[PDB]
Amino acid sequence: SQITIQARLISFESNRQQLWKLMADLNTPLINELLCQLGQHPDFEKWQQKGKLPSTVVSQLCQPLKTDPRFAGQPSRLYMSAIHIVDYIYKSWLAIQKRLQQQLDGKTRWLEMLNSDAELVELSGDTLEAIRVKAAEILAIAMSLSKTLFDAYQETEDIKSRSAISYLLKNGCKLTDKEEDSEKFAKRRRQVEIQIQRLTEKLISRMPKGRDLTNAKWLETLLTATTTVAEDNAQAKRWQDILLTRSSSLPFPLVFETNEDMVWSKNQKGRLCVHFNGLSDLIFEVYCGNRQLHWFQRFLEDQQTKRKSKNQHSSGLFTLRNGHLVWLEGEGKGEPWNLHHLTLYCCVDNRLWTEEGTEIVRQEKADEITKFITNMKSDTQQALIQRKQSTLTRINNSFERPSQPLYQGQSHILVGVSLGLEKPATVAVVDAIANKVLAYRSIKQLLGDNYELLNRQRRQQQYLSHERHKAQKNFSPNQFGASELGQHIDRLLAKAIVALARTYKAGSIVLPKLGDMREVVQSEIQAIAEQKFPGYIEGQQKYAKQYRVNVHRWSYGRLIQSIQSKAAQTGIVIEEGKQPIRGSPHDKAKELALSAYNLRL
């Protein structure tokens, strides 16, 4: 449901320079608090096993750095911004590492389980029919299915008769009469080996890096490498890998996770202003287009409404949720605080705009807070329960807000969206009780006046990829791509799909479980290419470049998110299902929506 809106902040130099000095000084303990985990912390491998960072460890590394002679000059809210960012860095990276570990194991199982029909006969000492009969018994026992069969191979080895359980699993949890081609099986088993290899490589990841602004390592390395002689090829390359590294120009943003830690006001000139907790001397002026101003007026109205009411209304329902203050990169020459541009990005929960939507968040938080208090039931823990119960009481007192009746769709009408390489979207609206398609749309309809933009995107990707190649050979800085055009097209389709869902009173939009299509294609094309260029690895990589590149450029996750966002701002439910391997783009969309309807029970 959340959105991010933005404004540039304007102030006189003294204020934009003082804030830069604090952020160039704050950017450094964001580096030192990474290193205090990256190599200093002894428990680190226990966290990599569990997949989660302990909720207090970054604060317990930061608390003694608050008096460090290098870091002591900063407000209490700038240290909380440091702790926030470093918590979110590790809390992300450990959660990436854990899903990779789980995938590697979850296929190391399957590379053991996957056997040819002849190997099952040898391993069982029995007929492939005896295996078909035992596979029929195992389905009769089971009737969670695929997991239950995996568990019944992980348990219940059963005098190697788990051979028949692998026979079900390789057949997609079904009986098969046909006996398989050993060349097709060799390609299949090789794809798993490739996925296993690729996972054992990706299992090791570069320990998350800090944004060093100082150039000190680079300058020290330059004067070392030019005046001294390396003792090894490894040392001479270690200096090369440092000297090639581009250094950052921007400090990490400030994060203000409490909405009240931004204070709003109106300037004499009638313009809006803002100030931050601990920087309450530095008034900043808001500059934003009238297409976004209504939120910045709402910020000040939410604040005035609470202050006019003796704090009896809660910022648990303030339209602003959190702010990220960032320096966007400028152009040309000048001091960093005169060259770059302070920009304030406000997280906003869009459903807090209206009274009917605010009531949803009131019920959502009142249920979550009630459960929290009953799960809790020590000294400061009682003070925390005072924060919570003052919220649980205050959240019932309403802000005066715009009214708009909630959208309601028919529980039987669904929009199916089918994504692919040639057709980025294609739509079928199904009445699932009639089994009747109400409408279909192809791309030429689904973004209408804008259909020239798909042809533009394909021209621009091809044109600009060649210009980047020509530019790199000359060391030109000019490096451009179609990324913002692809982002616009994915947003045009997201608006049109939801406008169509509203038009037909659909209860939900259905999006495919595409999963990691990029890795799957990379393994399939490799297992095939190894049969056509054996030993010539450069020829294996050249086999289907344009197909592999087009799959790595395929924006399916960004279109899926663009539709999710616009649907949840409108109130339409999102649902999911398996996308058919065969059929036209329409048939894919039709069967996808009907499948998601069948999954209701």
Partner: protein
């Protein structure tokens, strides 16, 4: 790259003879002269990517020539390191 006079000057000082057109002493010294003129520009023009390619090549050649000389004759190697101010 060096002026004509500057090459002639360097080769006449590190060369064992005026006809010593390409001994390791000469080559390493010339590379050292280039590198000493390129670090003064590359420390200032930090955006000049095309010159970092030139520097990293030119340092890596110097090291190969020195490793070859070290095994060939340690006395020539020691004198050359002294005369070029390297460590």
């Amino acid at each position: 790259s060096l002026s004509t006079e500057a090459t002639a000057k360097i080769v006449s000082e590190f060369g064992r003879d005026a006809n010593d057109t390409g001994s390791t002493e000469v080559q390493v010294a010339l590379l050292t002269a280039q590198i000493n003129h390129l670090q003064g520009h590359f420390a200032e023009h930090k955006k000049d990517h095309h010159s970092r390619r030139g520097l990293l090549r030119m340092v890596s050649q110097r090291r190969k020539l020195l490793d070859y000389l070290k095994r060939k004759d340690v006395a020539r190697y020691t004198q050359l390191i002294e005369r070029l101010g390297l460590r």
